[PDB]
Design goal:
homodimer; alpha/beta; Aspartate Aminotransferase, domain 1; Aspartate Aminotransferase, domain 2; 2 domains; seven-stranded mixed sheet; four-stranded mixed sheet; 16 helices; globular; binds pyridoxal-5'-phosphate
């Protein structure tokens, strides 16, 4: 009952899962904790800041570059002054996307401090586009109302009264202006996929499906409709139910009718090339083509969230380029801080980019000189030696995927699938809510199965894995590109061991 | 004509204000740019990352500590593992607030990556509290409906029909359940002060008054009511107009009546101890007492935004402690990164803290090992030598305030006031929209006066000032506590020069 100032419930829960350890040092693919005698125990990290560490913990090149930047007196805080490095970083990302998509498209960069902040820059810029469309629409409706009023008062035309159910000249116009104003003030909608993860701030949390994380906060901010990635013939009808009308007067020279016109409700569509909250499921070509159709049909941007899939994780710089997702806006974060600093970027296509965004959006820490310098170092490293780092991610990915398939094949009773691509992989666990072992069943019923199994891997095999998915029903594997053959072999041994214990329903060995 | 990838409009506008310079190096209170011949030109920084640099640029202690943390292989990415430093930081801030307020209150800490993110943790936790109040209220109303239904059906009591304007037993109950459900789904409200600045993300932007920054994004997220800080007898009535009711059945033994009960609409009240977007105006005792009354009356938390006013800027660690603002939640950011990294914290009083927040809120970069280590260094520095650093801020603040008053006294034709406290000060500029000089008048009409004057200070006196307030009608002075007497004298000379040119309406010298 001693005073506690942070993390009491978090630490309590981690301890009961078998994950209550303090990591005191990290290098490459290894984190170290202290045993009861104070000796360092090496642990293989498969979590790696949820994919932040493409080059591992504390990479010597990144550490050396950061120390040189600090010793040179880099200007970290230079707000409202010329910062050329931002333009230099945007140019590199622009060149990389042209190379990988073969499209000669140009993107403006706005920097931020987290993946959530970068996704919220996109939500905001998407809402600027929607307000432009609304102004244009309402300007036309005024002109259509003036013309109709002209025709009805002068006498040239008669008002059809079969149309009045949708709401007498001046009264009908005021009634249309009221209807349209109510509509204009309504919150927009965002479209996402089922299992989507786009961050946990007031705006972005509405775009994250995981129900315990989101549903408490529903009232704060614009909702998302979660489109079923699996059943995509249902997406058409879900979006069609979200159609909303404004009213105007249509003159067909001699007759005037009240009619509905489309109102732009949807601000943006968001998509992850590889779906973190769905267990690392890659977007299929069929789902990509449906997202393209919705973007072309609604005229709102398609925002590609590469916060996790970017900076080479999938075996290309851009996961979207590898899977043929043709986005309007793109976001990057995790790996761009080199595993030491915090940085993110929204890339917005220049033919849609509203220059007001460059001066009405800002942040104290955004575009700081230190994360800028380190971003340029990370881009230099991932681009080095004629694209060999992408080739190495692809080869390491194949090796790790092959091992995971070989484990699934012999353990199909407890593993349902292997998902993801490059070095962003996961095993799907079969439901254990009917397990013979009461301890396993109880944990699976509370959605803690994945964490319990992660605990086993830590204490028995010195391997750090974290679960994914809304019931911790997936085990994530997202190590650095320096993961060795020996470390993949040790992971295979650890998994065969874990899935043999789970098969044998050994609750005493798995659950504390 | 050439390809540009970021900042074309930002740089264009900075160049035309006379602020188009690249800072290449920074130490203490000085940033350096290169002249045409490639020599470093020293510039005195009064902006200092908008108050981030209480210890100046690249403080050797902070640089040395950051390099040691990188050389020791600090675990930056240790998500879902024991990170004791979070608890250790919260303990220090907890002790500091007890010392400065004399209250023996305890606070839980949630870390984030920016001031906006910390303010959004508070908005989210405030919405958890409101949902708890709503559940309790709706649980009572069910019990009140059951009891009334019992009394009306059994026969013991009669339903009064003078009360039905607010909507047979079953019908009246269904009509109350409909009314109450509509109300329950309505968006909450936040209360802020006029001129409030609380960040620029989807949620926090609604809490920031500056109209060009906010009004484009109105539709996205729950609105704020901006309370007039100046006219506080009007606040009572503005908040009273926001009262909303749910309905229930009140049994007074023989008689059952439909009655209104209070619905919790307001999620939180936010306040800055020193109001950045109002031109560094301190909260008066009268305004503090009104915020206290609203918090006690509505039962929502009072959130104190110390993102700018904290870590000693005002001459205490907490600005709220100095001005007697008794908050439920507190936020810190700018100076806690030591001018090199990005970190923020929400302190939520433990008797209000809902433990679900510890496991349903998270962020990839939050609570990273590197910013944690540097937070502990910054707290060690500001607390050192029995509170001498607070004494030094107070005496440097007095010296700088006295100089600014001495300039106002001789230049009252162009300067209306000195605002703020400690080392967070500003000059208010008199309106120049009627200036004889057409160049000055034109800039003042566009709200760019402060930027133009800042340009003068840079090119003619090598002094970096940035404006504040919604029409750049204030000049900010927020240097490090190492600002020398000689640097204050050079600033006085520069300001006398600027305000003499402004008096003389010398548009050719002031505007390019
Ligand atoms: C981690 C993550 C985010 C949010 O990034 P933060 O830095 O945690 O705000 C957004 N999208 C995806 C796909 C992520 O994995
Ligand atoms: C700067 C500031 C913020 C926003 O902090 P960021 O780090 O820019 O998101 C919020 N509140 C106040 C009072 C500030 O000065």
């Amino acid at each position: 009952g001693e005073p506690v100032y942070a993390d009491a419930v978090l630490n309590g829960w981690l301890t009961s899962m078998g994950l209550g350890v303090e990591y005191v040092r990290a290098e490459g693919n290894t984190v170290y904790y202290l045993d009861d005698e104070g000796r360092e125990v090496p642990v293989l990290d498969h979590a790696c800041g949820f994919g932040s560490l493409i080059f591992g913990h504390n990479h010597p090149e990144i550490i050396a570059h950061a120390k040189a930047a600090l010793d040179a007196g880099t200007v970290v805080h230079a707000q409202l002054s010329r910062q050329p490095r931002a333009n230099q970083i945007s140019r590199i990302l622009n060149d990389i996307m042209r190379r990988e998509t073969g499209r000669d498209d140009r993107y403006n960069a706005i920097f931020a401090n987290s993946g959530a902040e970068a996704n919220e820059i996109c939500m905001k810029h998407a809402e600027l586009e929607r307000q432009e469309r609304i102004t244009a629409l309402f300007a036309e409706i005024d002109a259509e109302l003036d013309t109709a009023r002209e025709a009805l008062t002068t006498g040239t035309a008669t008002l059809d009264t079969a149309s009045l159910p949708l709401v007498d000249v001046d009264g009908v116009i005021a009634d249309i202006h009221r209807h349209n104003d109510e509509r204009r003030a309504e919150r927009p909608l965002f479209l996402t996929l089922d299992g989507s993860f786009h961050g946990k701030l007031v705006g972005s949390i509405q775009l994250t499906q995981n129900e315990p994380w989101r549903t408490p906060f529903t009232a704060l901010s614009s909702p998302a409709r979660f489109l079923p990635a699996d059943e995509p013939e249902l997406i058409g009808k879900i979006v069609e139910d979200e159609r909303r009308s404004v009213l105007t007067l249509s003159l067909d020279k001699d007759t005037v009718r009240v009619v509905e016109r489309d109102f732009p409700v949807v601000a943006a569509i968001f998509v992850e090339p590889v779906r973190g909250g769905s267990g690392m499921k890659t977007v299929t070509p069929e789902l990509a083509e449906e997202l393209h159709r919705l973007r072309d049909t609604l005229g709102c941007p398609l925002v590609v969230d590469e916060v996790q899939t970017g900076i080479g994780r999938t075996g290309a710089f851009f996961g979207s380029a590898l899977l043929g997702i043709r986005g309007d806006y793109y976001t990057l974060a995790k790996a761009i801080g080199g595993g030491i600093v915090k940085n993110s970027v929204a890339l917005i296509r220049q033919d849609r980019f509203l220059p007001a965004m460059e001066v009405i959006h800002s942040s104290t820490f955004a575009k700081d000189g230190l994360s800028a310098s380190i971003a340029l170092k990370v881009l230099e490293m991932v681009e080095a030696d004629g694209g060999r780092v992408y080739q190495r991610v692809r080869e390491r990915g194949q090796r790790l995927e092959a091992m995971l398939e070989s484990v699934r094949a012999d353990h199909s009773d407890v593993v349902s699938a292997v998902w993801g691509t490059g070095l962003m992989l996961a095993l799907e666990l079969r439901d254990q809510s009917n397990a013979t072992s009461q301890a396993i069943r109880e944990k699976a019923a509370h959605g803690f199965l994945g964490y319990v199994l992660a605990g086993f891997l830590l204490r028995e095999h010195h391997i750090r894995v974290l679960p994914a998915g809304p019931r911790s029903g997936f085990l994530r594997f997202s190590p650095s590109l320096y993961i060795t053959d020996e470390e993949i072999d040790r992971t295979e041994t650890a998994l065969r061991s874990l899935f043999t214990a789970l098969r044998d329903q050994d609750g005493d060995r798995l659950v504390l």
